[PDB]
Amino acid sequence: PMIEFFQEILISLKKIKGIHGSAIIERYGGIISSTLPGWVNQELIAALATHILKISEKSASELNLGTFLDAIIENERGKLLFYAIGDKIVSVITTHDAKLGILDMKLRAALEKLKF
Amino acid sequence: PMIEFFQEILISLKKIKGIHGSAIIERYGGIISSTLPGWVNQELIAALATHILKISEKSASELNLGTFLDAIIENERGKLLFYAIGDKIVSVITTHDAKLGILDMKLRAALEKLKF
Ligand SMILES: [Zn+2]
Ligand SMILES: [Zn+2]
Ligand SMILES: [Zn+2]
Ligand SMILES: [Zn+2]
Ligand SMILES: [Zn+2]
Ligand SMILES: [Zn+2]
Ligand SMILES: [Zn+2]
Ligand SMILES: [Zn+2]
Q: For the purposes of burial, counting CB atoms within 10 Å of the CB of B105, is it exposed (0-12), middle (13-18) or buried (19 or more)?
A: middle
Strand partners, A88: A26, A85
B42-62 vs A42-62: helix crossing angle, rounded to 10: 170
Residue B6 φ then ψ, to 5°: -60, -45
Residue A99 φ then ψ, to 5°: -85, 125
B73 closest CA partner among A17, A97, A61, A86:
A61
CB contact under 8 A, A63 and B44: yes
Torsional class of A98: left (φ above 0), alpha (ψ -120 to 50), beta (otherwise): beta
C-beta of residue A68 within 8 angstroms of C-beta of residue A57: yes
Strand partners, B68: A75
Domains in chain A: ranges and CATH: 1-114 (3.30.450.30)
CB contact under 8 A, A75 and B56: yes
d(CA B43, CA A43): 32
Q: What ranges make up the beta strands (E) of chain B?
A: 19-26, 31-34, 68-75, 79-85, 88-94
d(CA B8, CA A107): 37
Residue B71 φ then ψ, to 5°: -140, 140
Cβ contacts (< 8 Å) between A70 and chain B: which residues?
74
Interface of A with B (CB under 8 A): 39-41, 44, 48, 51-52, 55-56, 59-60, 62-78, 80, 93, 99-102, 104
d(CA B89, CA A84): 25
| Half-sphere exposure of residue A53: CA atoms within 13 angstroms, side-chain side | 20
C-beta of residue A15 within 8 angstroms of C-beta of residue A79: no
d(CA A24, CA A46): 9
Instruction: Kindly give, in sequence order, each residue whose CB lies less than 8 Å from that of residue B22, ignoring residues fewer than 6 positions away.
Output: B10, B13, B34, B35, B36, B90, B91, B92, B93
Instruction: Kindly give, in sequence order, each residue whose CB lies less than 8 Å from that of residue A90, ignoring residues fewer than 6 positions away.
Output: A22, A23, A24, A25, A81, A82, A83, A107, A111, A114
Q: Would the annotation count A20 as a binding residue?
A: yes
The structure was resolved to a resolution in Å of 2.7
Instruction: Kindly give, in sequence order, each residue whose CB lies less than 8 Å from that of residue A78, ignoring residues fewer than 6 positions away.
Output: A20, A93, A94, A95, A96, B63, B65, B66
d(CA A75, CA B4): 30
